[PDB]
Design a protein around this nucleic acid. Structure first.
Length: 240
RNA sequence: AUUGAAAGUUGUAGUAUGCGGUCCUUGCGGCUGAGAGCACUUCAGGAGUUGCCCGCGCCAGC
């Protein structure tokens, strides 16, 4: 079990929830976006068998193959090691997909962007073959964007380091199943990308009344039997 | 190539046009750098010293 661990340094990201007008940005990246991020790496890097006539079909094939080798559909999670905040921008995001308004209609559209310096996201891979493991190491890098195109995310580092069974408080995100079994934040993040399903996840960021903006913090849930280390500091990760 | 795919919150706009920090005003009037004062008093340009000693206006001239 070689678990992928990558760190992304980005100014902002604007993956949002289902809402009209306002697109409320997710507090933490959903697993579907995270898995599509490296499914793009799969389809670009070795398009010999993972590229098809349709971009949607090739992306779906990559998603199916990448999820076949995960321990669970709810596998990937992020780690808010830097604090998170939310800002809003009124842009000229013209709305012309709804019925009417032709093609020359442009109106004020408010989009929410989440700011955090860096995040640590881990993909859980189960006994992947070495020959494809080298390609998957390469695909861990070049995670260019997360969600909206203007969410430029540059992966500073990526590696395959085994958890080696430590005990640490939870830092990476986890589904709202082990958290209940043992400052509460619950969300739905659509585990799988929707193409032409929904699960409940815990969120380990709490409020701090430090300034005018309330911003986000750490919750450190109780001990987990498995843990993963980065540069000598241990953090909690859970796997079914 | 992922709550995804395309998406200027934009185009025109003098914080301007006029306005003496100005007019009158002796740094002026009176005032000895003045009054008393020997650059004086005593002094030989003085003592001694030959303008010396020798010398035919000379011999022949009716």
């Amino acid at each position: 079990m070689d678990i992928l661990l990558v760190c992304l340094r980005f100014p902002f990201f604007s993956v949002a929830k289902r809402s009209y007008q306002v697109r409320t940005s997710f507090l933490l990246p959903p697993p579907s976006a995270l898995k599509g991020a490296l499914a793009k790496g799969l389809i670009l890097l070795k398009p010999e068998k993972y590229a098809s006539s349709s971009l949607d079909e090739a992306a779906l094939k990559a998603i199916k193959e990448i999820e076949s080798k995960l321990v669970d559909i709810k596998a990937v999670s992020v780690a808010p090691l830097s604090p998170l905040i939310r800002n809003a921008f009124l842009l000229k995001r013209l709305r012309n997909l709804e019925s009417g308004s032709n093609a020359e209609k442009s109106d004020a559209m408010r989009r929410e962007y989440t700011f955090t310096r860096e995040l640590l996201v881990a993909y859980i891979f189960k006994n992947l073959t070495q020959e494809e493991k080298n390609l998957y190491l390469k695909a861990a890098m070049l995670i260019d964007v997360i969600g909206d195109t203007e969410s430029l995310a540059t992966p500073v580092w990526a590696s395959f380091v085994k958890p080696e069974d430590k005990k640490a408080p939870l830092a990476f995100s986890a589904p709202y199943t082990e958290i209940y079994s043992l400052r509460m934040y619950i969300e739905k993040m659509r585990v799988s990308p929707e193409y032409s399903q929904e699960e409940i996840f815990y969120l380990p960021i709490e409020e701090r009344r430090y300034k005018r903006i309330v911003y986000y913090a750490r919750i450190y849930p109780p001990e987990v039997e498995k843990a993963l280390t980065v540069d000598g500091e241990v953090l909690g990760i859970w796997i079914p």
